[PDB]
Design a protein around this ligand. Structure first.
Ligand SMILES: CNC(=O)c1cnc(OCCO)c(F)c1-c1c(Cl)c(F)cc2c1C[C@](c1ccccc1)([C@@H]1CCCN1)O2
Ligand SMILES: CNC(=O)c1cnc(OCCO)c(F)c1-c1c(Cl)c(F)cc2c1C[C@](c1ccccc1)([C@@H]1CCCN1)O2
Ligand SMILES: CNC(=O)c1cnc(OCCO)c(F)c1-c1c(Cl)c(F)cc2c1C[C@](c1ccccc1)([C@@H]1CCCN1)O2
Ligand SMILES: CNC(=O)c1cnc(OCCO)c(F)c1-c1c(Cl)c(F)cc2c1C[C@](c1ccccc1)([C@@H]1CCCN1)O2
Ligand SMILES: *C(=O)CCCCCCCCCCCCC
Ligand SMILES: *C(=O)CCCCCCCCCCCCC
Lengths: 207, 207, 208, 208
């Protein structure tokens, strides 16, 4: 399903690990992935307790409400590649207007922000639209260590228990006006399916 | 003062701006390095304990040694303007060569990276040299809240005590090659002088 | 309202004075400001010709050369409500879809005569898929600073408006190498008497 | 002789008219020319009466300094009608500095010590052989100057041109655009050339 406010569209979002064993051998494992192409609503009060309290509530009140989405991820943490490994995030956005955007990714543990990454991006005019590409943004050591700790657990239900109190809040703003363009609240479980990583998108509402 | 063999820092300023009325604006500078006398050297091992294990030591070992500097700031946190206030950072760099730079600003508390902001800038030919201007980059909420918390302390010595374990590491790289162009370690105290904000620059060396 | 020809868009225009209160505190006063599209009212260019008598490089001559889409009239109600060391400046920004080197000529006319001309050349910068031209903090010439001071010393705002009837500014932006007219703005002035401060009104210049 | 302060050097200065009678015919007449190559001193108080006084004047600029930036140029302009005048009247000049900076060249034209017209041109440097060079190429003269040259040329005798020129002066002030620091100041005074060798000039260092 499509994640788009009236000002910005999320085209793609992937978090992955890449291994280049040698100059001729390359492997990539996707942890989570929202690829390029009806939404169910979720009351934002149902998730407030798990997010910062410039928190999710203040951001929602500031608006616009059409910019708010919840994504449930079932992350693939299976050791499918022999891990020099690179851990990264790639994402792509588009707008109708020519503007610089700022993508804030806040990582929270028990509702409290522990690390934050802020990336500004300039648009490329492409096919009449303005496209923003954040390509292979390295994951911070906190996240790489967190993934390694999860993978050392012997049971997927233990990974789910740890993940119950782990959340990510992505806030995209227009750099110069500081207007909220898109807000995505990410929640996680580990995937147990043969099809791998899965996701479900919901529109965040209030009343 | 601050220049490696590949990149020169022309200006750096952090400030708050208030709109008093539709035609009147006030600006308060917290810190400012404006636009050559010799620099005193500081052994980089004297500051590693506050910048421990992309860290300062790892970057310094990778080199070049001429790219590393330490700036001590005495920040002006006096309420000189009645604060909708904008908190921002403006900076300018220059080089003899045309390249795309990536500016990473890492905010650390007790030696741990809590926020990282990354901004990419494209060279502009100006007066026979290449200039990079990052104008009015908004401060993240973590920094605005940190400034507000410091200002609520009743004594300036308490602010200095909190600031003992707060550091900022700015790393400028050539975007495509990832070569280190300039690294600045920033450390802070609150200014108690009538002259306002002050700074002192040192060259980082390893005896 | 938006000032844009088919080749160049005016994003911002501000004239201001800046004062340093202490080493870390600066105050800025805007005299006039056009900040960052609703439709524009049209004004026949013959209704303003009598106030721009200057012939060579003047309004009528440029309008006749064209293109008509490049011509605008801005009415300003300037806010004239310091110490030594005050900075008087002008900041402006433009954008285009194409990469150009532009030349910005600002002609100041007083009592029907061109008294000052300031010329600035600007090189396109690729930003967000468009080309931006920024003329940041261009210092006002002493003639303009002294003119502002003389207006402020007048005891009545109607005397300021009478002196201002004879004062016009013509801004002509051209493509540097071809000398093609990209944008022409005729600026006319009054002093603001409102509590809201500086005001402006944009009109498109037409002929019949 | 060399016109250079510790921050800026004047390489060349020429005022001229060009006539392109047809696609194959070109003519150029130089009115004045300082081409690329000790100085006699003149006390700046000897010329104060002929230049702008009080605010932004020669005296105020001289007192602000640096004293090494101030020069007086006497010109004997060639006003002979040597070409059949569509003609273009222009000024071309070049400067150089050791530093990378944007300069602003103000040319004030004065009659009886009062500024009548001013042209301000900003220029960006080009890095050339380890020097930053500024070129103002074929800057069009304003109509005031073209009409003044035509009026002088209408006088039947050269002494009559010298009489009118007695109270005509040009003050060129070059500043660093962003800091407004004075880089170079040249006071120009004029007579008409009566020699077969044409246009002449003499450079003096202004002292106090
Ligand atoms: C306090 N409110 C909530 O816990 C909550 C309320 N309503 C939701 O959605 C409604 C639309 O269905 C949520 F998603 C969450 C939520 C939130 Cl806020 C969270 F931070 C983590 C988290 C969940 C659910 C869960 C998960 C399930 C599937 C995939 C990913 C995570 C579950 C929790 C048990 C183990 N796993 O982990
Ligand atoms: C353990 N080593 C250090 O602490 C250190 C060593 N040598 C330096 O420089 C050498 C040139 O002399 C430093 F700067 C620092 C340092 C560092 Cl690493 C830091 F993280 C914060 C910090 C300081 C100094 C200080 C400050 C004083 C004035 C202005 C700004 C900051 C002082 C600390 C007490 C309260 N304030 O805050
Ligand atoms: C001969 N034609 C004109 O005078 C004219 C005609 N039509 C206009 O607009 C049509 C859309 O409205 C104009 F603007 C002007 C004009 C022009 Cl050309 C000018 F050089 C100055 C000037 C004015 C009007 C004025 C002013 C008012 C408000 C703000 C600024 C200036 C008025 C004049 C009395 C005091 N103030 O000063
Ligand atoms: C009041 N002080 C002066 O008049 C003065 C004093 N001392 C000078 O020089 C010292 C080094 O000799 C001057 F140059 C000038 C001066 C100045 Cl300020 C001026 F505005 C015009 C002007 C002159 C001289 C003159 C001229 C002669 C030759 C060439 C160009 C001009 C002469 C005057 C009669 C006709 N022509 O026209
Ligand atoms: C540090 O700066 C981290 C930047 C944000 C990384 C987001 C990647 C999260 C998706 C991976 C899913 C792993 C299961 C928790
Ligand atoms: C209008 O903007 C004029 C700009 C300055 C023109 C300077 C040329 C003066 C030299 C010509 C000598 C003619 C004798 C008076």
């Amino acid at each position: 399903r499509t994640i788009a406010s009236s000002r910005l569209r999320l085209l793609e979002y992937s978090a992955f690990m890449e291994v280049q064993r040698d100059p001729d051998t390359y492997s990539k494992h996707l942890f989570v992935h929202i690829g390029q192409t009806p939404l169910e609503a979720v009351d934002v009060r149902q998730i407030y307790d798990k997010f910062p309290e410039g928190g999710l509530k203040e951001l929602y009140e500031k608006g616009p409400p059409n910019a708010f989405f919840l994504v449930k991820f079932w992350a693939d943490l299976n050791s499918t590649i022999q891990e020099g490994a690179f851990y990264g995030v790639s994402s792509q956005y588009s707008s109708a207007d020519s503007m610089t955007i700022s993508v804030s990714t806040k990582v929270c543990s028990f509702g409290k922000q522990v690390v934050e990454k802020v990336e500004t991006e300039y648009a490329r005019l492409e096919n009449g639209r303005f496209v923003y590409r954040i390509h292979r943004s390295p994951m911070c050591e906190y996240m790489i260590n967190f993934i390694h700790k999860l993978k050392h657990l012997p049971e997927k239900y233990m990974m789910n228990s740890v993940l119950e109190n782990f959340t990510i809040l992505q806030v995209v703003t227009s750099r110069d006006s500081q207007e909220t363009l898109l807000v995505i609240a990410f929640v996680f479980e580990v995937s147990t399916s043969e099809h791998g990583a899965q996701h479900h998108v919901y529109k965040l509402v209030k009343d």
